[PDB]
Amino acid sequence: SNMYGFGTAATGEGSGVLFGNPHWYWKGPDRFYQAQLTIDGEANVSGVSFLGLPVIQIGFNDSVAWSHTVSTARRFGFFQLSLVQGEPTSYLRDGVPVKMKPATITVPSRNADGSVSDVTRTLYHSEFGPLVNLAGLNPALAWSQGTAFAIRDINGENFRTLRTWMRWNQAKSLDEFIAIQKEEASIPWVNTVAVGRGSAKAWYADIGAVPNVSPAQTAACTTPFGMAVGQALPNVPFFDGSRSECDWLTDADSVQKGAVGVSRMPSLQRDDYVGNMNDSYWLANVHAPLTGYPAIFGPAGTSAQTLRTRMGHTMALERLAGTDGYAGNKATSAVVREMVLGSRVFSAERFKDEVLDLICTPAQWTVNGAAVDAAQACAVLAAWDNRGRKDSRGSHLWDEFWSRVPTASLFTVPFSAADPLNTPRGINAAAADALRQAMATAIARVGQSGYALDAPRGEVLYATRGGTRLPLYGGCGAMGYFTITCSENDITQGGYSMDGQPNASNSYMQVVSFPASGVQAHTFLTFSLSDDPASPHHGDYTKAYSAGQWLRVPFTEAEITGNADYRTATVKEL
Amino acid sequence: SNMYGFGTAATGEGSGVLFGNPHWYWKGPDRFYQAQLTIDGEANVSGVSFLGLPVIQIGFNDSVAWSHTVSTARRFGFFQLSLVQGEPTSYLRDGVPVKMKPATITVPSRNADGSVSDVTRTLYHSEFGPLVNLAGLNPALAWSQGTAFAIRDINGENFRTLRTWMRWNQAKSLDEFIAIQKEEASIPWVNTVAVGRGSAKAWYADIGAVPNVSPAQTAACTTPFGMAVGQALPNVPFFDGSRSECDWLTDADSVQKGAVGVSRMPSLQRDDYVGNMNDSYWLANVHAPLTGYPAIFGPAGTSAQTLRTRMGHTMALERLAGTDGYAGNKATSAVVREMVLGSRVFSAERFKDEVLDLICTPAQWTVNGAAVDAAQACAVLAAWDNRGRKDSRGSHLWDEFWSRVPTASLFTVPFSAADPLNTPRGINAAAADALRQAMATAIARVGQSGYALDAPRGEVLYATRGGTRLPLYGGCGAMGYFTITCSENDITQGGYSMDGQPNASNSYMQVVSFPASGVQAHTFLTFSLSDDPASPHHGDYTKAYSAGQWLRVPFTEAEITGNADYRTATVKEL
Amino acid sequence: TYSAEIRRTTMGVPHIKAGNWGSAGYGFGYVQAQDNLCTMADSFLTYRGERSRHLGGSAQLVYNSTLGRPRNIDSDFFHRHVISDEAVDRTMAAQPAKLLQMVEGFAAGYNRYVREAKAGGSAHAACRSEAWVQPITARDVWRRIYAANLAGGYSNFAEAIANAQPP
Amino acid sequence: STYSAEIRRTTMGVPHIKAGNWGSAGYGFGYVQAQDNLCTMADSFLTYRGERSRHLGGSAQLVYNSTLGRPRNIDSDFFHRHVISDEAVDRTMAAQPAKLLQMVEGFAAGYNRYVREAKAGGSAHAACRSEAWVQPITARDVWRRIYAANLAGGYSNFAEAIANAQPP
Amino acid sequence: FEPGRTRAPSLQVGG
Amino acid sequence: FEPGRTRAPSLQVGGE
Ligand SMILES: CCCCCCCCCC(=O)O
Ligand SMILES: *C(=O)CCCCCCCCC
């Protein structure tokens, strides 16, 4: 998921621009559904909900626009329980046996022979949350006669989330949006960016429900198992459930018991831009980095950023410098709309030339004792525009190659917090043989796919609707795309079809601004509103996405009734 | 898998007819590869080997022809071990501790980053065979302080199989073939049917390597754990490893220790027919059922036969009685070539009319409180020929329907051993709502697949070669097809495509007879010789299979050199 | 008496207009089901832990989600044990009045479309006549709402929670 | 003393190997199987040798279905190393007639011949020809494969469970 | 031993 | 405890 909030200094107008771009499911109940809710004297909100959810989670009203990206902040912890001897269903706590609340559950199950029979078992709660079989994590973490493990998720007791979106749906300004977020501290597992009318500063925050543990506490409370497994669960508090000094803490400005208080959660206001592409709060704005927040929120300058994060910030900077090939230097609604679909490929832009210089002279190779002719691969990649546009040629060759490059000692310029967009870099010359191995494989894979090395991407990457393959653009974040159209389908199995259950991809998109006459919003729902192949709204939106035609979504009453495809019907009952 | 052995009485001629029809993998190293081996003065044999195997496993020579089907006889057993207290790697044998043999094994493993690191673990053997982790079978069956489990496969000590086929490859008569099978008692997990030149009778046998346990042993040696889990491992001996009296037995005419002796393994010779379609030895010939063989071989008259077995024997009998709609009453080579591809559907032939009569008046329904128009479904099925031929219309509806019918008292005439082909039968009138529920679902599945309800099967069931979908015929055993073309693909995912890794299907097929002029064999290798999409032999045989054009495989030198596509070359080296 | 005006524009985007929160719930639940009945009805088996009853214990979840694709039987146990009646009660107790009204409408809007799909029409031929296309309750929607909150914790360990058993 | 086999191909590519001895029959047969099915086979020899994980990563499943089913590479590797041990191979070979031991040596040599050809050039087997796991094999490896085929009714079905049997 | 926690393995070679 | 036996779960909501 990506988002940008541009402030008035960035847009050069009276309000900023919000770009919302959750990368999410194309099918299933969590898929987005686009709608407007006009409630007399109450709310006029438009945007997107999960299927089955009744308020707008990402969208806009007359006064504010916002989006969300998944946050690096851990939202759960484990608790290692010391069991009472003789009694595996009871755990010790400060020296006293405490019984685990049981629940005997019977679930009817259809048998492969058609008849329906009951399946039953008893599951348990601790005071921390439900027990958890951790044998999968590591076989030594089995529920022994000595120890058991329970999981706690601070959202398991967060009953404030719906109201919070509800109040955002009603919000009358950015300042009000902010105060609601701070008041509720309810946001369960996502970042938030927002822009408001007449407000100069864009808003970023990871302000939500987040476990509260101290540095002193994790030193004292992490068990030997918690230590030995700590790297598989980074920043997850794996604590001693026997001692109560290890319970999650509660600050003086904490909204929920065991959760981080509001002033110790990262937020930022900028008049240029804020943005997030799934890395931590750290780089909300590249020029003014955020530091000094609890470990649990994720690394603040100690880890390399993902290729997509590097791409996303690069895009913002080059827009505001006027060096990205678009007109002027402002982040206007119109430019933002084009920019976010441009399908630039960070790995290619930064590393393709170096790779090709290193391995393409000569192009006749010996790989694993075998003659390999890489002349066509080399020439195709050299000629390729480093983009995943519908007419980009050889882009899929790059995908099959790059996704296979071993990353151990690939770069000779290590990550530097002082230059997070340009590091790590420098393709290692000692990697040459491995790079040739990967390229050899990539060539072979495109080989079985039946596609040519120089095929246009739109023929490889597509969505089928009404029996026709609609050409798509974009790619996967691993190659350092910002524009995400990321198939789960192997290239050899009919190309990069988006017809199945793709990986997190562009889904609901929105570019929202506030010109004098009122909120304007341009939108996509890439997979279309309806899951029914018979519906006329199964593939209309997808056709527009393929064409790069943003929908201007009507918002005012006059706009709704004046729309070319306007239909109305009333439904009543009780 | 299916096979027929037709005797001279049944063919009318001087020799019999062998039909070989293993249902097997279409991809992978266990797939068949078709070939002829001619070793100067020693062997001339043709047929098929697994990839990686050097002798012919299913085939024929100038004298004998044979095939195999997976046998119901269990080939393994579990031994429960009583562990020495304090020493979980030792086990008791008649009150004497015995060490388990350890093996410390290191396997290098490629990590997701590109590098390779060693992973190691110590595994163990018992005097019965390797130790085995049965916690997946049931978590109560874990390796504990006092209890462990080992598995014994009689083929673990069977070094005679390759030698057996080689001797078969060279065999000069059926008499010799049989004597070889008896001498070696090595056939690891399959039935065998063979026909000989100048021999009146066709041969059936489940003669090979089989664990030897007695009735007395089974009752006395099966442990409480063995009792508790036997239902999931039918006929598998699950014995007490502590007791030497529970070791596998050795008969006076056993070729291998702990294996069933030759005289107590099922075989039959008939001058009319023998056949097997994966049920037990019992009905090798419907007129002369076999009984009294050890329980491990499977049931002999206590169990209903599968729909495929009922189809296969019905086809045999209707041929010899002259009632199947082919010419005459003889099982000649040319007629067998047709009938085996006929694609009759047992479930439909027997129960469709009963089903339709029961639920199609009226054809407008209420199912689960919902209106369902079944007039098209009912009419298409009524008109359907009950076959899965290329132009058969509606057969896929039947597949989607029948596979979904609940079998809990679906039939009112239970299985009778004296009428094994025609029982169980008689659709229960009370199942009416359940059948309409099943039909409603079937309609819906075919609906969302894009196929019309009366679509010809050849558009639904196909193999793609050279970018064209070759139409196929046949189906899955579940529906009572004998001609097996059984896709792993759900109909909603682009029909019954055979391009992935289908379930056991027609693979190598042979129809072999011995006229005066010499052996004649007609064959298919359905998926074609070569796994390489670029190979000329990736799709040619598949095209012939689609067209139903049996290949007359050249056998004599004159036939090989006279073949229209003849190419020769010689390979040599030191 | 719920009453919602449903306006549709280009690409089918619905614009619900109502006088109160309950009726907004009604209009919104109606259009969602109208467009996505099979995904939604399948999803309510999920949160209620009734997947195995209809679809079999050993089958996987049809759609990927924040829940992943565990076995039906394990998902059913996960949702019953974690999204218990008590949890749903506790969830509801904290809600403002207008929101409890909205969810009520939403369930009732959904149920309206279910009746309509049961009655006839060429829409949702994939599932309209299936047993698991059935009405739902306000509590079932609350199950769904609560379920979305657990994406960061419990949802990631559903198989693991459903199989947490003592020696 | 040379392997020498005449390979006659007919309709559908069906090969008819003609040889003076068993070794040379094996040579021709090993050659044609590799010529038509190199990628499936090379992959398969990793399975029986227990060298899948090194090449393909430990957590990926077997590429192809077989009597083995599709366990994880790591577990398949331990299964085969454990059950199809060197002792198991030694014992299998000791029971063989001379002519079969020679056939299998021929077979490995023929397979290896085609591997040298695929490595040298050509368009056949473009999917795998340049991969490290396309490599020569030994007679012992063919015996591994032969022994594996026999286990389908028993050990093969419990590959993953045999690979993970250990005391507490 | 809870018989309802039993998971039957694959027993048909080729199935 | 044996770290070689550890299976890190994926903890990115919406990820692979
Ligand atoms: C409980 C719902 C959480 C917030 C809704 C936004 C979901 C978007 C996830 C993402 O950013 O990829
Ligand atoms: C069908 O069920 C059995 C076909 C497989 C036979 C394999 C050939 C014999 C190798 C032991």
Author numbering:
A (entry chain C), B (entry chain F): 1 to 574
C (entry chain A): 12 to 178
D (entry chain D): 11 to 178
E (entry chain E): 8 to 22
F (entry chain B): 8 to 23
What does the literature reporting this entry say, word for word?
The recombinant MacQ protein exhibited bifunctional acylase activity against various ranges of AHLs and against multiple β-lactam antibiotics, including penicillin G, ampicillin, and amoxicillin. The MacQ protein is comprised of 806 amino acid residues, including an N-terminal signal peptide, and belongs to the N-terminal nucleophile (Ntn) hydrolase superfamily. AHL-acylase is one of the enzymes capable of inactivating AHLs via hydrolysis of the amide bond of the acyl side-chain to produce homoserine lactone (HSL) and fatty acid. The MacQ structure clearly revealed a typical Ntn-hydrolase fold comprised of a four-layered α-β-β-α motif45 mainly composed of two polypeptide chains, α- and β-chains, generated by self-cleaving activity.
The crystal structures of MacQ, both ligand-free and in complex with the reaction products of decanoic acid (C10) and phenyl acetic acid (PAA), were determined at 2.6 Å, 2.2 Å, and 1.75 Å resolution, respectively. The C10 complex crystallized in the P1 space group, similar to that of ligand-free MacQ, while the PAA complex crystallized in the P21 space group. The reaction product, C10/PAA, was successfully trapped at the hydrophobic active-site pocket, while the electron density for the hydrolyzed counterpart, HSL/6-aminopenicillanic acid (6-APA), was not observed. The C10 was found in a different binding state in each active-site pocket. In one active site, the carboxyl group of C10 hydrogen-bonded with the side-chain hydroxyl and amino group of the catalytic residue Ser1β, while in the other active site the hydroxyl oxygen (Oγ) of Ser1β was covalently linked to the carbonyl carbon of the C10 molecule. These distinct binding states have also been observed in the structural analyses of PvdQ in complex with dodecanoic acid. Despite the different binding states of C10 at the active site pocket, the two heterodimers superimposed well with an RMS difference of ~0.3 Å for 756 Cα atoms. No side-chain conformational changes were detected around the active site, and therefore the factors that cause the different binding modes of the substrate in the different active sites remain unclear. The C10/PAA was accommodated in the highly hydrophobic active-site pocket created by the side-chains of Trp24β, Phe32β, Phe50β, Gln57β, Ile58β, His68β, Val70β, Trp165β, Trp189β, and Val190β. First, the SP is observed in all heterodimeric units of MacQ in the same conformation, both in the presence and absence of ligands.
